């Protein structure tokens, strides 16, 4: 029994070992109570404004749309403390842990952005934080690993199986299986078992709420579409949520196409995978014909996750949101274009969303359209990756 | 299903509890796994719990994680597991065979078709490690339609609603969880056993951390129907990978000792 | 003849070759006109808010002051687009260049933060940007150099003499000596010849103006002191300016003490150098007994500049502002402390200011004091430097 | 000061313009610099412009930047420069000697004391490259008190207020700047010359980019009093660092050609 519906249509659920169900029920009840608590909301609002820096700017990009009838705004989650939207919801979950009387934080991370976000929130709020990260990812993300440890967090490489995100996901749930009485599991995206897809959405929905207020102030109308990259789905659902009942506003999620959908080396399970049950949820997955969870692929580490949040699968199924993919090369061209013509260095994750907006503009340049891209993070973390590609390419 | 009811009736007539080992199918290879399983039965195992190798076993500690990867190193697939299961049943008509599954392998080609394949090869029960009772309806319905016992976990943190749920919905045996955490012999209940009997639950087997004869005798003394031991067996496999014959001799001596402890 | 006083007391002036005086007079007149132009002010305000992200947060740091009677706020210029306060005034100078009909930008940089700021402003406003940087600095700041080039700027290493900041300063003035009819020299700090110390202050004064409004809102009173690191003096004078007539507010500038003042390896000319004439101004300098300009030193590249802006020398002389120094080791301890107890990674430059506030607190822990630290940038750029020291040290 | 007035009076009597080379003192070494300077005079130089090596010569192009660093490579200091200057004056009583200074070297131990030292060793003029007329008051006052001509730059972008300023304040000669930019022979005015004469300015010498005899004759034809050449001389030094004797012979032939061009 739960207080809230664990499913979005047929997607979602609570597919965890029985031993973890009391932890999820506790978390659901604490969340439901906190959402009715003006004291909790005020503390969350205080941290978001005075510590993280909200509201974030909404930037009109004039140079990149010149000569077309597209107006393009970027919602600047790259300016949030920590450098990405991940910071929003870890502050809320850290307050939820304290509401429950918990003193320790467990977190998983692939790219390191959510782990850095979890470590900074725990340092600020006095929580002891431990972060699981696939050993492969520890090796390629030495900067973010050092950031986490500077903030007092314990970073634990996971040599299980593939030694990547999903195995870090596994060891986090393994740990929480025995420690949930004192520790809260701070999941990093809008996926996993209920109540996490719901909590993460509500603790990211200021993205879309601010965007709506800002576009109404600047343009006098709602956007024609809002566009966001989709790894697990947290920045996208944060941008989408306040527009879901504005049925004139298109909701476009961009999955990583990697080397090309036809190559199989991609991260686009929503449109090109198959529904399965893993990581506590029923959701589209990258999986073998035999039902083993496959490895995804993307140039951007933050999108390299073989599933997707269940609310996205549901919004797709009913036709409310449309999902597309963008390849490595398209994302790289969008990265360069924003650097050179707007002076903003975007995360390679966010560059997937920008690339699709640039496609919408370039394919139909006399179509009048007002677009907002969720600029989910800054791309300082990506300059070494881009440098190595650019000069291995010749340019 | 039928094989558990016959086993427990015979064990009580012999004033014995059940000893039930777990191994991963195909660890460390198909041929050696089949010899491992025959040794366990010949040494005194009353029933079997058998894991199908899965990419992401989030309920298993490091010992069984490595067992899954050893099986993957041999190229073991679910289809090869079900051919093994048919051969095991053809050799052992009365031994109850339970599967330890992860939900995606059951759901992959259709939940009903999974349990139909279980019936065809002679499996007796299926435990789906990441399906709580709250999500269990389609699994337990398919199980019962194909004469498969659905096995439910009774955790130590259970309440009375859960106990009534597991008692009503389960068949074959009730998996009496020793503790929180994941599977493992590194980390080592009478109240629950009485309420389960009160609610006419399937007979209880304690698992998760049973590694010594004293723990088997303790489970029988607590009025449980028996005990399950997975990691202790898998560790013996892991210790003896270089000497297959020693592996079987060490397995035989451990199983014999654990089964001896179930008389009293 | 000038419109504004080129001197602060005896410090400052316009000590440039005669050929450059018409360029400085043009710039002064354009600045004076722009400051009376509501259209210019509105465009500058638009860029600061919607592109750079102003206002920046004022963060109360509770954990680091626990058990003392110090209340410490951090003015979060680390959250500004680009990662430091440098962005503020390059946006204003880029608009001044356009006001003059100029289409090219010349800039100098030592650490790379001002060069990155100049490149992003020029990309946004459609100016062709070229950036001089000592060859030594090009080698040690490969990340920032790659950022500048991604934004379309030309980065030119200077092999002159010491091949560091001052020689980059020299080649910039050399270039401007012949190109001033089409190019504007975008100086990066509150130093150099008039009118630059005045312009840079006025285009940074939103730091202190926002701080005053924010502290009055949160605390109901003015701070007891505001504290800022001093390289050339731009973030410090930006924080100080709106408080200069609030004579109860202490103004504390922190110079880099390097390995220790007594070692001579420091960057503290205001308190431990000697007045000289160089870089277009009369100001305290690091210089040999013979009047050759010496090399400064600091662990932080952004403070490694052998002089100081003339307004700081003047504020010191009349006793309105006090200047102190902080060594490498003190700055490193402040860096670690903020990471671990507030979840903020500060620039090693800003860590000098934090270190002195922590000293004020720790030396007199029962003294009631309300302090604001100018947190001039984020320290992502510094994690490799800190990592190498920490493990060469043993910890 | 007096030596420039006597020189220009003699040159006009000989119907000649002045040719004035620039070199950095102590480039490439003290001993070789002194021989360089004696060769320039013996070859036809009418006056000298001599640079004191400075850490940050922001008005010099790459040729003279490298000259400063060569001098620093030899350990040349301002004090060693002033000992050279005294020896040069003792050898050459009538040759006007002008210094090219940067402001900090003049200001370092006191502006008045700098010009007193200039008088003691027999310097005739001082050009401070980074002091515009707007900042010149303490420098020109100290200069005049010690019988030193303050040399002012007339740029090509000058207006009439500037022309009247340089004409009134300057002595010795007016430095007629060829162009914007910095010193150099890689980058190669009669209106200003007439107004300067109208305002009774010191006689004009054109500099910045004079590298060929045709340019000297052009300056004389434009009614200037002569021409200054720095980088062309320094380049000859830079070309011949490995052969000191060839360096002096090449210097002699260039100076002789440039001085010949000043007759007409
Ligand atoms: C800057 C940025 N944009 C988008 C995403 C995509 O995540 P959602 O779909 O928004 O939840 C990420 C994710 N990062 C994860 C994955 O490794 C992590 O840090 O651990 C990100 O860092
Ligand atoms: C983050 C930060 N804080 C303080 C300063 C110090 O500069 P002011 O005193 O505020 O003008 C700097 C400077 N950087 C220069 C020097 O190389 C540059 O980037 O080129 C800085 O980057
Ligand atoms: O002796 P141990 O500690 O290795 O325990 C035996 C493990 N093998 S098993 O098939 O019975 C088994 C039973 C339940 C499991 O997870 C769940 F409880 F969530 F369902 C996992 C494995
Ligand atoms: O022939 P070039 O092009 O090398 O010119 C000669 C340079 N030597 S100099 O002493 O007369 C000389 C004169 C003026 C200078 O700068 C200033 F104009 F700003 F004052 C610098 C050098
Ligand atoms: Cl419900
Ligand atoms: Cl359902
Ligand atoms: Cl709410
Ligand atoms: Cl690192
Ligand atoms: Cl808003
Ligand atoms: Cl409007
Ligand atoms: Cl097209
Ligand atoms: Cl048997
Ligand atoms: Cl059956
Ligand atoms: Cl059966
Ligand atoms: Cl039953
Ligand atoms: Cl004035
Ligand atoms: Cl004055
Ligand atoms: Cl104003
Ligand atoms: Cl790089
Ligand atoms: Cl404000
Ligand atoms: Cl108040
Ligand atoms: Cl003390
Ligand atoms: Cl002669
Ligand atoms: Cl004299
Ligand atoms: Cl004299
Ligand atoms: Cl005169
Ligand atoms: Cs447009
Ligand atoms: Cs994905
Ligand atoms: Cs305090
Ligand atoms: Cs300094």
Coordinates of N, CA, C and O in Angstrom, one line a residue, chain C residues 130-253:
Chain C
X130 N 41.6 39.5 -29.7 CA 42.9 38.9 -29.6 C 43.5 39.2 -28.2 O 43.4 40.3 -27.7
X131 N 44.1 38.2 -27.6 CA 44.5 38.1 -26.2 C 45.9 37.8 -26.1 O 46.4 36.7 -26.5
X132 N 46.7 38.7 -25.4 CA 48.1 38.4 -25.1 C 48.3 37.7 -23.8 O 47.6 38.1 -22.8
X133 N 49.2 36.8 -23.7 CA 49.4 36.0 -22.6 C 50.8 35.5 -22.6 O 51.3 35.0 -23.6
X134 N 51.6 35.8 -21.5 CA 52.9 35.4 -21.4 C 53.1 33.9 -21.7 O 52.3 33.1 -21.3
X135 N 54.1 33.6 -22.5 CA 54.3 32.2 -22.9 C 54.4 31.2 -21.8 O 53.8 30.1 -21.8
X136 N 55.0 31.6 -20.7 CA 55.0 30.8 -19.4 C 53.6 30.5 -19.0 O 53.3 29.4 -18.6
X137 N 52.7 31.5 -19.1 CA 51.3 31.3 -18.7 C 50.5 30.5 -19.6 O 49.6 29.7 -19.2
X138 N 50.8 30.6 -20.9 CA 50.1 29.7 -21.9 C 50.4 28.3 -21.6 O 49.5 27.4 -21.6
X139 N 51.6 28.0 -21.3 CA 52.0 26.6 -20.9 C 51.3 26.1 -19.7 O 50.8 25.0 -19.6
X140 N 51.1 27.0 -18.7 CA 50.5 26.4 -17.4 C 49.0 26.6 -17.4 O 48.4 26.1 -16.4
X141 N 48.4 27.3 -18.4 CA 47.0 27.5 -18.4 C 46.3 26.9 -19.7 O 45.5 27.6 -20.3
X142 N 46.7 25.7 -20.1 CA 46.1 25.1 -21.2 C 44.6 25.0 -21.2 O 44.0 25.2 -22.3
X143 N 43.9 24.7 -20.1 CA 42.5 24.7 -20.1 C 41.9 26.1 -20.5 O 41.1 26.1 -21.4
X144 N 42.3 27.2 -19.9 CA 41.7 28.5 -20.2 C 42.1 28.9 -21.6 O 41.3 29.6 -22.3
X145 N 43.3 28.6 -22.1 CA 43.6 28.9 -23.4 C 42.7 28.2 -24.4 O 42.3 28.8 -25.4
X146 N 42.4 26.9 -24.1 CA 41.5 26.2 -25.0 C 40.1 26.8 -25.0 O 39.4 26.8 -26.0
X147 N 39.6 27.3 -23.8 CA 38.3 27.9 -23.7 C 38.3 29.2 -24.5 O 37.3 29.4 -25.3
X148 N 39.3 30.0 -24.5 CA 39.4 31.2 -25.3 C 39.3 30.9 -26.8 O 38.6 31.6 -27.5
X149 N 40.0 29.9 -27.2 CA 40.0 29.6 -28.6 C 38.7 29.0 -29.1 O 38.2 29.3 -30.2
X150 N 38.0 28.2 -28.2 CA 36.7 27.7 -28.5 C 35.7 28.9 -28.8 O 34.8 28.7 -29.5
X151 N 35.9 30.0 -28.1 CA 35.0 31.1 -28.2 C 35.5 32.1 -29.4 O 34.9 33.2 -29.5
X152 N 36.4 31.6 -30.2 CA 36.7 32.3 -31.4 C 37.8 33.4 -31.3 O 38.1 34.1 -32.2
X153 N 38.4 33.5 -30.1 CA 39.5 34.5 -29.9 C 40.8 34.0 -30.3 O 41.1 32.8 -30.3
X154 N 41.7 34.9 -30.7 CA 43.1 34.6 -31.0 C 43.9 34.8 -29.7 O 43.9 35.8 -29.1
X155 N 44.6 33.7 -29.3 CA 45.5 33.8 -28.1 C 46.9 33.8 -28.6 O 47.4 33.0 -29.4
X156 N 47.7 34.9 -28.2 CA 49.0 35.1 -28.7 C 50.0 35.0 -27.5 O 50.0 35.9 -26.7
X157 N 50.8 34.0 -27.5 CA 51.9 33.9 -26.4 C 52.9 35.0 -26.6 O 53.4 35.2 -27.7
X158 N 53.4 35.5 -25.5 CA 54.4 36.6 -25.5 C 55.7 36.1 -25.0 O 55.8 35.7 -23.8
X159 N 56.7 35.9 -25.8 CA 58.0 35.5 -25.4 C 58.9 36.6 -25.0 O 60.1 36.4 -24.7
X160 N 58.4 37.8 -24.9 CA 59.2 39.0 -24.4 C 59.7 38.7 -23.0 O 58.9 38.2 -22.1
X161 N 60.9 39.1 -22.7 CA 61.5 39.2 -21.4 C 61.1 38.0 -20.5 O 61.5 36.9 -20.7
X162 N 60.3 38.4 -19.4 CA 59.9 37.4 -18.4 C 58.8 36.4 -19.0 O 58.6 35.4 -18.4
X163 N 58.2 36.8 -20.1 CA 57.1 36.0 -20.7 C 56.0 35.7 -19.7 O 55.6 34.5 -19.5
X164 N 55.6 36.7 -19.0 CA 54.5 36.6 -18.0 C 53.6 37.8 -18.2 O 53.6 38.5 -19.2
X165 N 52.8 38.0 -17.2 CA 51.7 39.1 -17.2 C 52.2 40.4 -17.7 O 51.6 41.0 -18.6
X166 N 53.3 40.9 -17.1 CA 53.7 42.3 -17.4 C 54.2 42.4 -18.9 O 53.9 43.4 -19.5
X167 N 54.8 41.3 -19.4 CA 55.2 41.4 -20.8 C 53.9 41.2 -21.7 O 53.9 41.9 -22.8
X168 N 52.9 40.5 -21.3 CA 51.7 40.5 -22.0 C 51.0 41.8 -21.9 O 50.4 42.3 -22.9
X169 N 51.1 42.5 -20.8 CA 50.7 43.9 -20.6 C 51.4 44.8 -21.6 O 50.8 45.7 -22.2
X170 N 52.7 44.6 -21.8 CA 53.5 45.4 -22.7 C 53.1 45.2 -24.2 O 52.8 46.2 -24.9
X171 N 52.9 44.0 -24.6 CA 52.6 43.7 -26.0 C 51.2 44.2 -26.3 O 50.9 44.6 -27.5
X172 N 50.3 44.2 -25.3 CA 49.0 44.7 -25.6 C 49.0 46.2 -25.8 O 48.4 46.7 -26.8
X173 N 49.8 47.0 -25.0 CA 49.9 48.4 -25.3 C 50.7 48.7 -26.5 O 50.4 49.6 -27.3
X174 N 51.7 47.8 -26.9 CA 52.4 47.9 -28.1 C 51.4 47.8 -29.3 O 51.5 48.6 -30.2
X175 N 50.6 46.8 -29.3 CA 49.6 46.6 -30.3 C 48.6 47.8 -30.4 O 48.4 48.3 -31.5
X176 N 48.1 48.2 -29.3 CA 47.1 49.3 -29.2 C 47.8 50.6 -29.7 O 47.1 51.4 -30.3
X177 N 49.1 50.7 -29.6 CA 49.8 51.9 -30.1 C 49.6 52.2 -31.5 O 49.7 53.3 -32.0
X178 N 49.2 51.1 -32.3 CA 49.1 51.3 -33.7 C 47.7 51.1 -34.3 O 47.3 51.5 -35.4
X179 N 46.8 50.4 -33.4 CA 45.5 49.9 -33.9 C 44.4 50.6 -33.2 O 43.2 50.2 -33.4
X180 N 44.6 51.6 -32.3 CA 43.6 52.2 -31.5 C 42.4 52.8 -32.3 O 41.3 53.0 -31.7
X181 N 42.6 53.0 -33.6 CA 41.5 53.6 -34.4 C 40.4 52.6 -34.6 O 39.2 53.0 -34.7
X182 N 40.7 51.3 -34.6 CA 39.7 50.3 -34.8 C 39.5 49.3 -33.7 O 38.5 48.6 -33.6
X183 N 40.5 49.3 -32.7 CA 40.5 48.3 -31.7 C 40.4 49.0 -30.3 O 41.0 50.1 -30.1
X184 N 39.8 48.4 -29.4 CA 39.7 48.8 -28.0 C 40.6 47.9 -27.1 O 40.4 46.7 -27.2
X185 N 41.4 48.5 -26.2 CA 42.2 47.7 -25.3 C 41.4 47.4 -24.0 O 41.1 48.3 -23.3
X186 N 41.0 46.2 -23.8 CA 40.1 45.8 -22.7 C 41.0 45.3 -21.5 O 41.2 44.1 -21.3
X187 N 41.4 46.3 -20.7 CA 42.3 46.0 -19.6 C 41.5 45.3 -18.5 O 40.3 45.6 -18.3
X188 N 42.1 44.4 -17.8 CA 41.5 43.4 -17.0 C 41.4 43.7 -15.5 O 40.9 42.9 -14.7
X189 N 41.9 44.9 -15.0 CA 41.9 45.1 -13.6 C 41.8 46.7 -13.4 O 41.9 47.4 -14.3
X190 N 41.7 47.1 -12.1 CA 41.5 48.5 -11.8 C 42.9 49.2 -11.7 O 43.2 49.7 -10.6
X191 N 43.6 49.1 -12.7 CA 45.0 49.6 -12.8 C 45.3 50.1 -14.2 O 44.4 50.1 -15.0
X192 N 46.5 50.5 -14.4 CA 46.9 51.1 -15.7 C 46.6 52.6 -15.7 O 46.3 53.2 -14.7
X193 N 46.7 53.2 -16.9 CA 46.5 54.6 -17.0 C 45.0 55.0 -16.9 O 44.2 54.2 -17.3
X194 N 44.8 56.2 -16.4 CA 43.5 56.8 -16.5 C 43.0 56.8 -17.9 O 43.8 57.1 -18.8
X195 N 41.8 56.4 -18.2 CA 40.6 56.2 -17.3 C 40.4 54.8 -16.8 O 39.3 54.6 -16.2
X196 N 41.3 53.8 -17.0 CA 40.9 52.5 -16.6 C 40.6 52.2 -15.2 O 39.7 51.5 -14.9
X197 N 41.4 52.7 -14.2 CA 41.1 52.5 -12.8 C 39.7 52.9 -12.4 O 38.9 52.3 -11.7
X198 N 39.2 54.1 -13.0 CA 37.9 54.6 -12.8 C 36.8 53.7 -13.5 O 35.8 53.4 -12.9
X199 N 37.0 53.4 -14.8 CA 36.1 52.6 -15.5 C 35.8 51.2 -14.9 O 34.7 50.8 -14.7
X200 N 36.9 50.6 -14.5 CA 36.8 49.2 -14.0 C 36.1 49.2 -12.7 O 35.2 48.3 -12.4
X201 N 36.4 50.2 -11.8 CA 35.6 50.3 -10.6 C 34.1 50.5 -10.9 O 33.3 49.8 -10.3
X202 N 33.8 51.4 -11.8 CA 32.4 51.7 -11.9 C 31.6 50.5 -12.6 O 30.5 50.3 -12.3
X203 N 32.3 49.7 -13.4 CA 31.8 48.5 -14.0 C 31.9 47.3 -13.1 O 31.5 46.2 -13.5
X204 N 32.5 47.4 -11.9 CA 32.5 46.4 -10.9 C 31.7 46.7 -9.7 O 31.5 45.9 -8.8
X205 N 31.1 48.0 -9.6 CA 30.6 48.4 -8.3 C 29.3 47.7 -7.9 O 28.8 47.9 -6.8
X206 N 28.7 46.9 -8.9 CA 27.5 46.2 -8.5 C 27.8 45.1 -7.5 O 26.9 44.7 -6.8
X207 N 29.0 44.7 -7.4 CA 29.4 43.7 -6.3 C 29.0 44.3 -4.9 O 28.3 43.7 -4.2
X208 N 29.5 45.5 -4.6 CA 29.3 46.1 -3.3 C 27.9 46.6 -3.2 O 27.3 46.6 -2.1
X209 N 27.3 47.2 -4.3 CA 25.9 47.7 -4.2 C 25.0 46.5 -3.9 O 24.1 46.7 -3.0
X210 N 25.1 45.4 -4.6 CA 24.3 44.2 -4.3 C 24.5 43.8 -2.8 O 23.6 43.5 -2.1
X211 N 25.8 43.7 -2.4 CA 26.1 43.2 -1.1 C 25.4 44.1 0.0 O 24.8 43.6 0.9
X212 N 25.5 45.4 -0.2 CA 24.9 46.3 0.8 C 23.3 46.0 0.9 O 22.8 45.9 2.0
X213 N 22.7 46.0 -0.3 CA 21.2 45.7 -0.3 C 20.9 44.4 0.4 O 20.0 44.2 1.1
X214 N 21.7 43.4 0.1 CA 21.5 42.0 0.6 C 21.7 41.9 2.1 O 20.9 41.3 2.8
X215 N 22.8 42.5 2.5 CA 23.1 42.4 4.0 C 22.1 43.2 4.8 O 21.6 42.8 5.9
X216 N 21.6 44.4 4.2 CA 20.6 45.1 4.9 C 19.3 44.3 5.0 O 18.6 44.4 6.0
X217 N 18.9 43.6 4.0 CA 17.7 42.8 4.0 C 17.8 41.6 5.0 O 16.9 41.3 5.7
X218 N 19.0 41.0 5.0 CA 19.2 39.8 5.9 C 19.5 40.1 7.3 O 19.1 39.4 8.2
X219 N 20.3 41.2 7.6 CA 20.8 41.5 8.9 C 20.3 42.8 9.5 O 20.4 43.0 10.7
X220 N 19.7 43.6 8.6 CA 19.2 44.9 9.1 C 20.3 46.0 9.4 O 19.9 47.0 10.0
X221 N 21.5 45.7 9.0 CA 22.6 46.6 9.3 C 23.7 46.4 8.2 O 23.7 45.4 7.5
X222 N 24.7 47.3 8.2 CA 25.8 47.2 7.4 C 26.8 46.2 8.0 O 26.9 46.0 9.2
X223 N 27.7 45.6 7.1 CA 28.7 44.8 7.7 C 29.7 45.5 8.5 O 29.9 46.8 8.3
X224 N 30.4 44.8 9.4 CA 31.5 45.4 10.1 C 32.7 45.6 9.2 O 33.5 46.5 9.4
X225 N 32.9 44.6 8.3 CA 34.0 44.7 7.3 C 33.7 43.9 6.1 O 33.0 42.9 6.2
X226 N 34.2 44.4 5.0 CA 34.2 43.6 3.7 C 35.6 43.3 3.3 O 36.5 44.2 3.5
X227 N 35.9 42.1 2.8 CA 37.2 41.6 2.7 C 37.3 41.0 1.3 O 36.5 40.2 0.8
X228 N 38.4 41.4 0.6 CA 38.6 41.0 -0.8 C 40.1 40.8 -1.1 O 40.9 41.6 -0.6
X229 N 40.4 39.8 -1.9 CA 41.8 39.7 -2.4 C 42.1 40.8 -3.4 O 41.2 41.4 -4.0
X230 N 43.4 41.1 -3.5 CA 43.9 42.2 -4.3 C 45.0 41.7 -5.2 O 46.1 41.5 -4.7
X231 N 44.7 41.6 -6.5 CA 45.7 41.4 -7.5 C 46.0 42.8 -8.1 O 46.8 43.5 -7.5
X232 N 45.4 43.1 -9.2 CA 45.3 44.5 -9.6 C 44.3 45.4 -8.8 O 44.5 46.6 -8.8
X233 N 43.3 44.8 -8.3 CA 42.4 45.5 -7.4 C 40.9 45.6 -7.9 O 40.1 46.3 -7.2
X234 N 40.5 44.9 -8.9 CA 39.2 45.1 -9.5 C 38.1 44.5 -8.6 O 37.1 45.2 -8.4
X235 N 38.2 43.2 -8.2 CA 37.1 42.7 -7.3 C 37.0 43.4 -6.0 O 35.9 43.7 -5.5
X236 N 38.2 43.8 -5.4 CA 38.2 44.5 -4.2 C 37.6 45.9 -4.3 O 36.7 46.3 -3.5
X237 N 37.9 46.7 -5.3 CA 37.4 48.0 -5.5 C 35.9 47.9 -5.9 O 35.1 48.8 -5.5
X238 N 35.5 46.9 -6.6 CA 34.1 46.7 -6.8 C 33.3 46.4 -5.6 O 32.2 46.9 -5.4
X239 N 33.8 45.6 -4.7 CA 33.2 45.4 -3.4 C 33.2 46.7 -2.5 O 32.2 47.0 -1.8
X240 N 34.4 47.4 -2.5 CA 34.5 48.5 -1.6 C 33.7 49.7 -2.0 O 33.2 50.5 -1.1
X241 N 33.5 50.0 -3.3 CA 33.1 51.3 -3.8 C 31.9 51.9 -3.1 O 31.9 53.0 -2.6
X242 N 30.8 51.1 -3.0 CA 29.6 51.6 -2.5 C 29.6 51.7 -0.9 O 28.7 52.3 -0.4
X243 N 30.7 51.2 -0.3 CA 30.8 51.4 1.1 C 31.8 52.5 1.5 O 32.0 52.8 2.7
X244 N 32.5 53.1 0.6 CA 33.5 54.1 0.9 C 33.0 55.2 1.8 O 33.7 55.6 2.8
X245 N 31.8 55.7 1.5 CA 31.2 56.7 2.4 C 30.5 56.2 3.7 O 30.1 57.0 4.5
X246 N 30.5 54.9 3.8 CA 29.9 54.3 5.1 C 31.1 54.1 6.0 O 31.7 53.0 6.1
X247 N 31.5 55.1 6.8 CA 32.8 55.1 7.4 C 32.9 54.1 8.6 O 34.0 53.8 9.1
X248 N 31.7 53.5 9.0 CA 31.8 52.4 10.0 C 32.2 51.0 9.4 O 32.4 50.1 10.1
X249 N 32.2 50.9 8.0 CA 32.4 49.6 7.4 C 33.9 49.5 7.1 O 34.4 50.3 6.3
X250 N 34.6 48.6 7.7 CA 36.0 48.3 7.4 C 36.1 47.8 6.0 O 35.3 47.1 5.5
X251 N 37.2 48.2 5.3 CA 37.5 47.8 3.9 C 38.9 47.1 4.0 O 39.9 47.8 4.3
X252 N 38.9 45.8 3.8 CA 40.2 45.0 4.0 C 40.5 44.4 2.7 O 39.8 43.5 2.2
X253 N 41.7 44.8 2.1 CA 42.2 44.1 1.0 C 43.4 43.2 1.3 O 44.2 43.5 2.2

